[PDB]
Design a protein around this motif. Sequence first.
Motif, short mmCIF file in Angstrom:
data_model
loop_
_atom_site.label_atom_id
_atom_site.label_comp_id
_atom_site.label_asym_id
_atom_site.label_seq_id
_atom_site.Cartn_x
_atom_site.Cartn_y
_atom_site.Cartn_z
N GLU A 179 1.00 -1.48 0.32
CA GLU A 179 0.24 0.23 0.15
C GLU A 179 0.67 1.18 0.31
OE1 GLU A 179 -1.15 2.20 3.81
OE2 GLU A 179 -3.99 0.98 2.44
N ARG A 180 1.63 0.98 1.42
CA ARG A 180 2.89 2.51 0.66
C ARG A 180 3.23 2.78 -0.23
NH1 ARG A 180 7.85 3.83 1.19
NH2 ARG A 180 8.63 2.30 1.04
N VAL A 181 3.76 1.81 -1.25
CA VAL A 181 4.22 1.67 -2.33
C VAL A 181 3.64 2.69 -3.19
CG1 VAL A 181 6.05 1.76 -4.31
CG2 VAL A 181 6.62 0.60 -1.48
N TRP A 182 2.85 1.69 -3.47
CA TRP A 182 1.39 2.25 -4.74
C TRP A 182 1.31 3.35 -4.52
CZ3 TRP A 182 1.60 0.45 -9.16
CH2 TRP A 182 2.68 -0.96 -9.53
N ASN A 183 0.73 3.72 -3.24
CA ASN A 183 -0.05 5.49 -3.09
C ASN A 183 1.42 6.60 -3.10
OD1 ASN A 183 -2.82 5.28 -2.14
ND2 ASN A 183 -1.80 3.58 -1.19
N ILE A 184 2.01 6.33 -2.48
CA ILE A 184 3.20 7.23 -2.87
C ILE A 184 3.78 7.30 -4.37
CG2 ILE A 184 5.85 7.08 -2.85
CD1 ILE A 184 3.92 6.74 0.33
N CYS A 185 3.58 6.07 -4.79
CA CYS A 185 4.23 6.18 -6.15
C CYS A 185 3.43 6.92 -7.98
CB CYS A 185 4.71 4.64 -7.07
SG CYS A 185 6.06 4.08 -6.33
N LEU A 186 1.95 6.32 -7.05
CA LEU A 186 1.21 7.35 -8.20
C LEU A 186 0.59 8.73 -7.29
CD1 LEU A 186 -1.60 3.83 -8.55
CD2 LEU A 186 0.06 5.09 -10.38
N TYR A 187 0.26 8.80 -6.48
CA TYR A 187 -0.11 10.27 -5.70
C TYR A 187 0.62 10.87 -5.32
CZ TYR A 187 -4.64 7.01 -6.35
OH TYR A 187 -5.47 6.39 -6.93
N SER A 188 2.36 10.94 -5.04
CA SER A 188 2.60 12.05 -4.43
C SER A 188 4.31 11.50 -5.58
CB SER A 188 2.99 11.04 -3.02
OG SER A 188 1.88 11.11 -1.80
N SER A 189 4.56 10.65 -6.35
CA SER A 189 5.86 10.54 -6.14
C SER A 189 6.19 11.86 -7.35
CB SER A 189 6.65 9.11 -6.92
OG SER A 189 5.54 8.64 -7.90
N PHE A 190 7.04 11.78 -8.30
CA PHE A 190 7.65 12.55 -8.71
C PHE A 190 7.04 12.69 -10.40
CE2 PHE A 190 10.92 14.12 -6.79
CZ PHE A 190 11.39 15.08 -6.57
N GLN A 191 6.91 11.44 -10.61
CA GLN A 191 6.46 10.06 -11.91
C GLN A 191 5.06 9.64 -11.61
OE1 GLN A 191 7.83 10.79 -13.88
NE2 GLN A 191 9.72 10.73 -12.50
N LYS A 192 4.06 10.59 -10.50
CA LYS A 192 2.52 10.54 -10.26
C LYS A 192 1.62 10.65 -11.03
CE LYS A 192 2.50 15.26 -9.12
NZ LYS A 192 3.67 16.12 -8.97
N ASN A 193 2.44 11.55 -12.75
CA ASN A 193 1.04 11.86 -13.60
C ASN A 193 1.58 10.78 -14.59
OD1 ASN A 193 -0.59 13.50 -11.85
ND2 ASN A 193 0.95 15.07 -12.58
N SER A 194 2.99 10.03 -14.71
CA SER A 194 3.86 9.14 -15.64
C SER A 194 2.88 7.90 -15.97
CB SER A 194 4.79 9.71 -15.32
OG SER A 194 5.29 11.12 -15.20
N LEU A 195 2.50 7.53 -15.17
CA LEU A 195 2.03 5.95 -15.17
C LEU A 195 0.69 6.09 -15.62
CD1 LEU A 195 3.94 4.69 -12.03
CD2 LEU A 195 4.94 5.33 -14.94
N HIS A 196 -0.05 6.90 -16.69
CA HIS A 196 -1.70 6.64 -16.73
C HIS A 196 -2.26 4.97 -16.43
CE1 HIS A 196 0.29 10.37 -18.89
NE2 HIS A 196 -0.68 11.21 -17.35
N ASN A 197 -1.67 4.12 -17.89
CA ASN A 197 -2.53 2.65 -17.67
C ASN A 197 -1.89 2.64 -16.50
OD1 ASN A 197 -2.13 3.63 -20.40
ND2 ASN A 197 -1.15 2.24 -20.92
N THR A 198 -0.95 2.35 -15.64
CA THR A 198 -1.03 1.31 -14.31
C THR A 198 -2.12 2.14 -13.51
OG1 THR A 198 1.16 0.92 -14.58
CG2 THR A 198 0.67 1.06 -12.40
N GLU A 199 -1.80 3.50 -13.67
CA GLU A 199 -3.00 4.27 -12.72
C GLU A 199 -4.56 3.77 -12.39
OE1 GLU A 199 -2.13 8.10 -10.91
OE2 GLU A 199 -4.30 8.91 -11.35
#
Lengths: 300, 237
Positions: A269-289
């Motif tokens: 949970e921590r990693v995915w929420n960080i990656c999709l919603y907080s990280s620098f790349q939060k807007n770069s993974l459209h298909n995965t999100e």
Amino acid sequence: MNTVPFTSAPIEVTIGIDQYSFNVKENQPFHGIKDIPIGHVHVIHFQHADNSSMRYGYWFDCRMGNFYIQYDPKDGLYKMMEERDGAKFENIVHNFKERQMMVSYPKIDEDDTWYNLTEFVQMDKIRKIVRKDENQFSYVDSSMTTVQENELSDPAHSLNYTVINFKSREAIRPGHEMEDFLDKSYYLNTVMLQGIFKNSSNYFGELQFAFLNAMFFGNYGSSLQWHAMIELICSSATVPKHMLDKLDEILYYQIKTLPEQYSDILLNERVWNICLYSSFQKNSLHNTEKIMENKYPELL
Amino acid sequence: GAMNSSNYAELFNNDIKLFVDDTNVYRVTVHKTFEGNVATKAINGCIFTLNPKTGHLFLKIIHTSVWAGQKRLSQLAKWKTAEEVSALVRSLPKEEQPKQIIVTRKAMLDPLEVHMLDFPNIAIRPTELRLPFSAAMSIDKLSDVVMKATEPQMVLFNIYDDWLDRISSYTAFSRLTLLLRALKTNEESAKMILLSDPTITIKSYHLWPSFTDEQWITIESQMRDLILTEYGRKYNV
Ligand SMILES: O=C(C1CCCCC1)N1CCC(NO)CC1
């Protein structure tokens, strides 16, 4: 199309071949798997009906040898072996096919799932992570620990994934402590990509292999490795555009393939929420999100 | 791991340790602009780094120039704190370096761990104690040196004055935390208690007045009363 012959199936077992699986009953007339696509690595894996403990299996590439499975009643498992006599092997396989004692690798022609999960995975790199140089195939099971886990115990039976540690001198340049910890681009691009992996294909290959070992064997250290390699990219402000687009595709097919019922134990949970919603790349993974939000909105 | 009431005497054993409190590193006044917007103006700050066994206070003064042109100052302040503590440790002889650093706020853990990677054997720990070290700037002589600083500066103090000649470091720490808790709860009242008697003075080389043993017992009682007083004023009890 290649074949993996089974001497026999003396114990009841669930057999996996890549993302497929089927049940074999005790002493059932099963002699193996045919029509295996050439060009990809493959994994053949096992869970005994009487002790679902220890999933185990073998990564192999049929271009590298003629491989078969034979049950060992002393060590109590199905073992992969290499047949060096090519004529003996062709003769054996032809008999098995004529008697239709084999399951057919069941590839739908529209379906690129296995290619998409193993695009960057190469047998030669698997054999460096899994050290047993006398065989051309690689044994993995549920219990094998990683080199990093052994730092925090038998080395011959370890998964030698590349050690990633965000609070390590390797990750943090003196005098750039805050910068390198909050923006991991240095560690990703100079240390890991240029320094250790040499290119993004090798990085993605290890990432994909870690995921597949996590999914097929419930291997906890592999799951840790998969999430660390995702997080390192997502936590870097400077990532080549082609790597972000490829990562999005890689993760999309991993999330797509994951059993819905194993999401609770294979996804951090921590990693995915960080990656999709907080990280620098939060807007770069459209298909995965999009697939994450529609398949596992609970986790988020 | 974390430091709390169960392992409290650990603070006064013979393993060198430091508390680090960052609550006064980044300090601002908030004011209205001519257009009626709001802006901040930084003022000088300090890192409060304390050896609780000896009383030695390493007061690193944070001059407002260190924020010039920087973004996200509340985040930077934790990293600046960690940078300065690491520099302090590196400046000490090996046999004086701490074996543990206890941070009073959990947000300092990662900044300090990262700055201290060269010192794998120094444990970086949080605490469940609610310590009143933010009130350090209510000690007049500490506030004075911070506000007068025109450049980065470290100043060394013994926050216990000469108390350890007469009491143990457990008792000295207890007195210090009671004084600071009082100053945090009602600074005016606490300072009136400490200074209402003009015959008891503060030595030039001390922070607190030269109370006798009997006078400290009275002062300490007056501070407990104040803390109970404000508690009733606050909660209407
Ligand atoms: O399956 C068999 C036997 C073939 C003859 C009839 C009974 C089974 N093999 C034996 C071991 C192999 N060696 O290449 C391959 C597998």
